[PDB]
Amino acid sequence: MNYKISELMPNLSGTINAEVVTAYPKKEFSTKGQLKSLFLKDDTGSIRGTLWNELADFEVKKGDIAEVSGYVKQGGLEISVDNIGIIEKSL
């Protein structure tokens, strides 16, 4: 089932449909990795999302409503993104 952010639990893998409230600058490091953090929100709460490696270059904009699938862990909670798609563009 699709989850509301308030329903997320640690060590849980699921999908949430949420608004990108913020998209932070991509960070590159070392044989090669990348990180792009997102702050996601729905009508029940907010959570940090982490886009790794190639997904750090995924075209996402503030205001976009995205389908984010991933693993929830304590970082409070954060979702390590496995897959992301745009449901409705900010525009």
Could you identify the residue written with the tokens 């990795």? 33
Single-letter amino acid code for the residue at 11: N
Which structure tokens are listed for 51? Answer: 């886009």
Number of domains the chain contains: 1
Which method was used? X-ray
Could you identify the residue written with the tokens 């009508």? 43
Instruction: Count CB atoms within 10 A of the CB of residue 77.
Output: 16
Instruction: Report which DSSP code applies to 56.
Output: G
What's 78's domain CATH number?
2.40.50.140
Resolution (Å) of this entry: 1.6
Q: Where are the alpha helices (DSSP H) in 1-91?
A: none
Give the separation between CA 78 and CA 16, rounded to whole angstroms: 12
Find residue 47's DSSP bridge partners. Answer: 40
Radius of gyration for the alpha carbons in the chain, expressed in angstroms and rounded: 12
What range does the domain containing 10 cover? 2-91
Distances in Å between the Cα of 70 and the Cα atoms of 30, 31, 48 are: 23, 23, 12
Q: Do β-strands 27-29 and 45-52 pair in parallel, antiparallel, or remain unpaired?
A: unpaired
